Write a sequence for this structure.
């Protein structure tokens, strides 16, 4: 047995496993318990630290996926099922994973901490596209990723109550960050150089950790890929969170008619229900027909988030913080097949004008008829207001700008103007092996496999250019993790990545071509979402 | 003795004058009375036909300019003085002019009828840039132009009353069209081929003759240069027209202190005032601070205009009609020096952001704060929201699109989609002799001198290519007058001018270069003005 596959942490001993990459081995410690199993009376409660254990915990394989909805839109399709759970579901899921180089670093090494996305209702650290063996081998970094409770188990909230306070899934991530502080040195990791990175709901989580003081001390840099805490989907109000939790209780027979009412009797009834029963009614508590809206998300309650993310972003001091943010080329196209009329992954989705006007209401729920008119005005090409291909790309722009691109640009500009050093990108390469239709372009989430170096997997059919491209991206992310600057610390030959500033708004395009600098993250479109539309909603 | 300078019309005999051009002489009959002098009790009343006369009326020189405000913004400046009256002011001003080729045409020849602009408060057929000798010589058509009452004398209105019904200036133009029908044959002109063309308020007048049945029978084609009857400045409501007329009465002491003020006593008191006194208070009755707004304009009374121009445009059947419409490249820049803060013709007018925001309220008066926010949203470059040059061009676009380009675009599309054959242009040549500053671009009204072939004047310093350019334009205008199609009926080699359609929205650019076809008359900007902004004001 190799001695480096045995490690002692504060709770006991672990045995890891050695993973192969074409460039060399990596030591992995998969399935480390960092919290007590949040089961029975602990359902909906904040996590408690894992009590110390005797013997050697086996850390050679991923642990269970947290209970979550399983996507059935295209059964058997690679594009959807690559995100579905690949381990059995269980409420016993609070486990984390540590990848470390071989040989183990003798000097403290910067640490990357991955937070998976999935709309706060799904996701797992065990997904194949989150395999950290290639990023750790190529860049000699320590990589950590945790599981956190999603859906009702992580974010059902009766605000104010002690039995279901909400945001416990965010607290799971924090506890994992506290664990990295106390234990990552045992793997050769530097707890003074901890960079967070996450995609979609993981990116929003990273943002919410920036805005929560108890979390802000546990890390030093942030990477937000295609997501932001200020998004219209990433938070809900106290009243709406209470209404969703009460309706979920009703759908599963809580409280038993008609005995019950207060929050204590409601959560107690919810705690007796099998986990699969709660999952089976999760989507039915959404208030309207929509896409890119999720039932149980972080709640703005005054505790984890003392104010709304937008308020904390505006009032925040971010001096001494380095941030990397970005988006993919087609943020919205993915979501249209989940409810927008006329869309299908198996045809060209050449929608009609009427289907476009209906899709706007699904893509922008809970706006006045007048607000929808402004959206139609801004996203119609009035030289070709009936062209199906342009309408398809326009509805994609509507959903992507409203949910991802403009919340990210709002955040990136506020951070740079308030002390943070910001770098911005737009990912523009469509994977050659992508199974989604060509009209979706570079869809939401399909930069992750390049960040994690998946093209290096010899059992995959990526092109030679994509392997070089993945290595360049891993260098950018690692350089940012080590130094706070994605640019090569001294290489002047490679094109340079300028910081993002509220004035110049410079960002780079990430594709097979060398870096190219551009200005403005859809500046015209995002002025509509960030500046005008709120003023329109005020005066109804 | 040239006998062709002698003509008999229905009212008597006339003696014209021969005008010289570099290409040959032209016979001109300037100052033909077509109405009784609208003086004394006739002030504010519809015109009456000129009673027949004995002897030979001298028609060798232009008659008096109708009483009007004289522009004093830049005293002594060519750019402003070229529009001021160049003959004595008088209420005895209802005279028209006829140019005809030499030798007189023996066959009935198509007739161009010019209607001058000037915001319905100014203008005169005697202005040097309306000299018809070059258009008539080069293209062998008959040209007619009339004087019509402007300001209070043409458009003061107490709706309902008989003493000041309004729109009498439009009736003056109609009477001149009736005169052309009854008399233009005596000059070699074909009353079955009459093309109206006008600029600015003249273009708005031409449009209102399309929408008035009694006038619609007196002509066969329309040309609307930089103006439309549906503009926000071209008409006024009954209630507002009554308020303006009543305030004018108050400012000139009408009615006297302690006197009833029904419409009869008010107009009677107004008729006793010297004409210059009414002029001296004309601008004081505008309801708020503005540019491109005029005190006395056509009123939507139910008589001359049975409904609003917009309503009549939408419900109208225009089969059998050919229209030529167009705009200059920089419609708005001219007006900014008449009230927009920070603007001056003698500097670069590099306005600040605050001046831009103030200018929007002056350029778009009578809109809510939310409407102004939408205007700022649509016209700000949010990548350079403080750049003075871009803000200067943006406010020019605001004023020009709101007042000219979008009313013209809406009209052109409704005409083409409802039976009319339509041709559209954008005039993009800045005269080499233009005295206005370079930042104004191609300002409002500076295509007229090219349409009338003024570059051919030997006493002017136009370039050789501007002389050739002027000849192309006169050919386009005359071909449209003859056939209804500006394209050369012979030459297939010359670039073709496609009709404007509500779908393809094709137009051509007019400059020193050959014709270039483009699509959309600022389609994105005009969707804001024509589609969204009305919905925004309805919801207040
Ligand atoms: C079952 O009902 C619904 C299911 C979904 C929606 C709405 C629904 O009801 C209307 C959505 O809007 C979802 C669309 C996302 C699902 C996950 N993928 C993949 C992905 C996962 C993690 C990171 C990045 C991409 C992207 C689109 C799912
Ligand atoms: C004295 O008060 C005012 C005077 C004017 C305005 C506002 C005023 O008060 C705010 C305007 O908006 C006017 C601007 C026009 C004046 C004449 N020219 C020239 C022209 C004449 C005829 C056809 C084409 C061009 C174009 C702009 C004048």
């Amino acid at each position: 047995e190799d001695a480096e596959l045995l490690v002692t942490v504060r709770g006991g001993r672990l045995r890891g496993i050695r993973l192969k990459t074409p460039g060399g081995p990596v030591s992995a410690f998969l399935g480390i318990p960092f919290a007590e199993p949040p089961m029975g009376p602990r359902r909906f409660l904040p996590p408690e630290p894992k009590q110390p254990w005797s013997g050697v915990v086996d850390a050679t394989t991923f642990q269970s996926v947290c209970y979550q909805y399983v996507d059935t839109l295209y059964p058997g399709f690679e594009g959807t099922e690559m995100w579905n759970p690949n381990r059995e579901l269980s409420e016993d899921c609070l486990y984390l994973n540590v990848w470390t180089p071989y040989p183990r670093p003798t000097s403290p090494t910067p640490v990357l901490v991955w937070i998976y996305g999935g709309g706060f209702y799904s996701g797992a650290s065990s997904l194949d596209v989150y395999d950290g063996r290639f990023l750790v081998q190529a860049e000699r970094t320590v990589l950590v990723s945790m599981n956190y409770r999603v859906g009702a188990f992580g974010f059902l909230a009766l605000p104010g109550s002690r039995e279901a306070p909400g945001n416990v899934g965010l607290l799971d991530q924090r506890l994992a960050l506290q664990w990295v502080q106390e234990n990552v040195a045992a793997f050769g990791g530097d707890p003074t150089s901890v960079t967070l990175f996450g995609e979609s709901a993981g990116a929003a989580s990273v943002g919410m950790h920036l805005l929560s003081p108890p979390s802000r001390g546990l890390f030093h840099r942030a990477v937000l890929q295609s997501g932001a805490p200020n998004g219209p989907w990433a938070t809900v109000g106290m009243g709406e969170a209470r209404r969703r939790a009460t309706q979920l209780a009703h759908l599963v027979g809580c409280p038993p008619g008609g005995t019950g009412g207060n929050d204590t009797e409601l959560v107690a009834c919810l705690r007796t229900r099998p986990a699969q029963v709660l999952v089976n009614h999760e989507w039915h508590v959404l208030p309207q027909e929509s896409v890119f809206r999720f039932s149980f998300v972080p709640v703005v309650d005054g505790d984890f988030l003392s104010d709304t993310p937008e308020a904390l972003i505006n009032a925040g001091d971010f001096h001494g913080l380095q941030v990397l943010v970005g988006v993919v080329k087609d943020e919205g196209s993915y979501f249209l097949v989940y409810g927008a009329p006329g869309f299908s992954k198996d045809n060209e989705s050449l929608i009609s004008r009427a289907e476009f006007l209906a899709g706007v209401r699904v893509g922008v729920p809970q706006v006045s008829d007048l607000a929808a008119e402004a959206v139609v005005l801004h996203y119609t090409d009035w030289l070709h207001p009936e062209d199906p291909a342009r309408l398809r790309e326009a509805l994609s722009d509507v959903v992507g700008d409203h949910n991802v691109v403009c919340p990210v640009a709002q955040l990136a500009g506020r951070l740079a103007a308030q002390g943070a050093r910001v770098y911005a990108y737009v990912f523009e390469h469509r994977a050659s092996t992508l199974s989604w239709p060509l009209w979706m372009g570079v869809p939401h989430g399909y930069e992750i496999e390049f960040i994690f170096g998946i093209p290096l997997d010899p059992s995959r059919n990526y092109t030679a250019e994509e392997k070089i491209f993945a290595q360049r991206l891993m260098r950018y992310w690692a350089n940012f993790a080590r130094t706070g600057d994605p640019n090569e610390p001294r290489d002047p030959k490679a094109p340079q990545w300028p910081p993002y500033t509220a004035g110049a708004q410079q960002y780079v395009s990430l594709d097979l071509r060398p870096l190219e600098v551009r200005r403005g993250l859809r500046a015209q479109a995002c002025a509509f979402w960030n500046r005008f539309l709120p003023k329109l909603l005020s005066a109804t």
About this structure: Chain B is about 35% helix and 15% strand.
